[PDB]
Amino acid sequence: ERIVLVDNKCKCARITSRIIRSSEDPNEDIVERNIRIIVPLNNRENISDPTSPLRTRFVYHLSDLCKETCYTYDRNKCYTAVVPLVYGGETKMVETALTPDACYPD
Amino acid sequence: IRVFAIPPSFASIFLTKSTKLTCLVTDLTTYDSVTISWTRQNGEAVKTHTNISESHPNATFSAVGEASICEDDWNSGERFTCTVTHTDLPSPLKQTISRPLHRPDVYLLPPAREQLNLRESATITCLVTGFSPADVFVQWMQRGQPLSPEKYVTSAPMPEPQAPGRYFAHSILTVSEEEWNTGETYTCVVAHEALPNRVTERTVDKSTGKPTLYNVSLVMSDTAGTC
Amino acid sequence: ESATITCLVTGFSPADVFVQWMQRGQPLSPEKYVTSAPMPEPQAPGRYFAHSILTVSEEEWNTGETYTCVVAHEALPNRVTERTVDKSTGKPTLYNVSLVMS
Amino acid sequence: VSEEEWNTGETYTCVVAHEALPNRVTERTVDKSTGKPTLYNVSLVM
Ligand SMILES: *[C@@H]1O[C@H](CO)[C@@H](O[C@@H]2O[C@H](CO)[C@@H](O)[C@H](O)[C@H]2NC(C)=O)[C@H](O)[C@H]1NC(C)=O
Ligand SMILES: *[C@@H]1O[C@H](CO)[C@@H](O)[C@H](O)[C@H]1NC(C)=O
Ligand SMILES: *[C@@H]1O[C@H](CO)[C@@H](O)[C@H](O)[C@H]1NC(C)=O
Ligand SMILES: *[C@@H]1O[C@H](CO)[C@@H](O)[C@H](O)[C@H]1NC(C)=O
């Protein structure tokens, strides 16, 4: 019964609006926005770069997300980085899987 | 024998997908099949008038040089002239028409709450402002079907005091108050020259608007990367 | 960029309407606001409607200002009817904020 | 007016007649919703 206007995945916002149906009377029925936004609370500022510090200031521009480095990982997409590896004198750069269940071989 | 040269409107070039470049001559003498030549710089003349006045009680013989030509022809803006060959007036009647941008700020307003309290009807207007020139097409969209011209009224554009070049036009949609309570999405559609798609689609309904209640709910979740 | 207030007037049958705009209880210059000519509605051929458009700066609208619109007509009970809005002229907009530390 | 009438929130406009008024008359409105300015309630659930 609620219309999901905007569902951005990185900001993990859920812009959805619902109307409570009133009784038999002139219309004063309440229109609501059922916005339910979720914080990671432990992710870093550069989501692709693992070597970033903790992000504390989360800026949620609600008008902007309707239509910028993004907050939480999405299981559909891959956020991957390259890490150096050494067996000796040689240095080899190998792509790594930052999050499971997203880039698993399917 | 009226000397008048009227061009088509830019609202008509999309509503009807046709243009007519005419020499509006009315109150002419009662002579059938008069020779009226409306020629441009290229030299092409309009077709003879058909399905038009031949005999009327008020003696207003309307001899109009209507012809179906390409809509892009007048967009190119070639100069059009009128030549009148009439037996009553040997001197030909000559008149020439010619044509000389801002993004159309077509923005939509919800009904007032006093309309809802009265319960008589509801009114919605599309504030078509900041567009130049006055040529604009205003249409209404509900339930995926174009509303009849009877239901809605679009006012003539007027000069804007803030910007002399830009004009504003308002058009109200008057509906029953019971109809607006149910969702019909009351889509607003407009057409203007300085617009990318030639159509800007605006929408107002009861679902979208100023809400009575706001519950913003955040969880300080620790399981991240799963949304 | 600006704040535009639409004064929607409907229901005058003699088709002669006159609209002013008053801010802070004092009349405003006629240049700022423009009133359209009357024309009838399709629902009621006898009645007519006209619109008054005032364009004002958005920052001034952010501050609490009256921007009262007044309509003068013979058929009115007192021949003068004034209506006003504000930045908070609508419903109180109850909040329902929830914060979770789970 | 009756107490129950005010809960229904009719307009109750007031007019005054005077020479010094530029319009010779002015209007004011008071309702049940003229106050209650943005009342909030915040739930902190663990
Ligand atoms: C930090 O975020 C920036 C984006 O603002 C990214 O830097 C570049 O991202 C592109 C696309 O992934 C890569 O092709 C470039 O190689 C990145 N730049 C560098 C210097 O590596 C990236 O997501 C983050 N930067 C780093 C260094 O990880
Ligand atoms: C917001 O309020 C409605 C009822 O008014 C409720 O059903 C809904 O669950 C609330 N939103 C959240 C996130 O709890
Ligand atoms: C919002 O108010 C509703 C009642 O309309 C209540 O059920 C709900 O729990 C409230 N939301 C909170 C406390 O987050
Ligand atoms: C918040 O306000 C609504 C509106 O009255 C109320 O129903 C709800 O129970 C309130 N919630 C809390 C936690 O106070």
Residue numbers in the entry:
A (entry chain J): 3 to 69, 98 to 136
B (entry chain L): 345 to 444, 449 to 575
C (entry chain K): 468 to 569
D (entry chain H): 523 to 568
Provide the authors' own sentences about this structure as they appear in the paper.
The predominant form of IgM is an asymmetrical pentamer, with five IgM monomers joined together by the joining chain (J-chain). In this work, we present the cryo-electron microscopy (cryo-EM) structures of VAR2CSA, TM284VAR1, DBLMSP, and DBLMSP2 complexed with human IgM core. In all these structures, Fcμ–J exhibits a pentameric architecture, with the J-chain conferring asymmetry on the central Fcμ platform, as seen in the complex with the secretory component (SC), i.e., the ectodomain of the polymeric immunoglobulin receptor (pIgR). The pIgR/SC-binding face of Fcμ–J is also targeted by the P. falciparum proteins, and the interactions between the P. falciparum proteins and Fcμ–J exclusively involve the Fcμ-Cμ4 domains, which is consistent with previous analyses.
Full-length DBLMSP protein is unstable and tends to form heterogeneous oligomers in solution. We further performed the cryo-EM study using DBLMSPDBL and determined the complex structure with Fcμ–J. Different from the DBL domains in VAR2CSA and TM284VAR1, DBLMSPDBL interacts intimately with Fcμ1A, Fcμ1B, and Fcμ2B using all three subdomains. In SD1, a loop involving DBLMSP residues Ile140–Ala143 inserts into the groove between Cμ4Fcμ1A and Cμ4Fcμ1B, whereas His173–Arg174 contact Cμ4Fcμ2B. In SD2, Asp229–Ile232 pack with the 525–530 helix in Cμ4Fcμ1B. Glu352, Asn356, and Arg357 in SD3 engage Cμ4Fcμ1A. Indeed, two DBLMSPDBL mutants, N169A/H173A/R174A (M1) and D229A/Y230A/Q231A (M2), do not bind to Fcμ–J. Interestingly, full-length DBLMSP, but not the monomeric DBLMSPDBL domain, interferes with IgM-mediated complement activation. DBLMSPDBL and DBLMSP2DBL bind to Fcμ1–Fcμ2 using all three subdomains; however, despite this overall similar binding pattern, each protein employs a distinct set of residues to bind these Fcμ molecules.
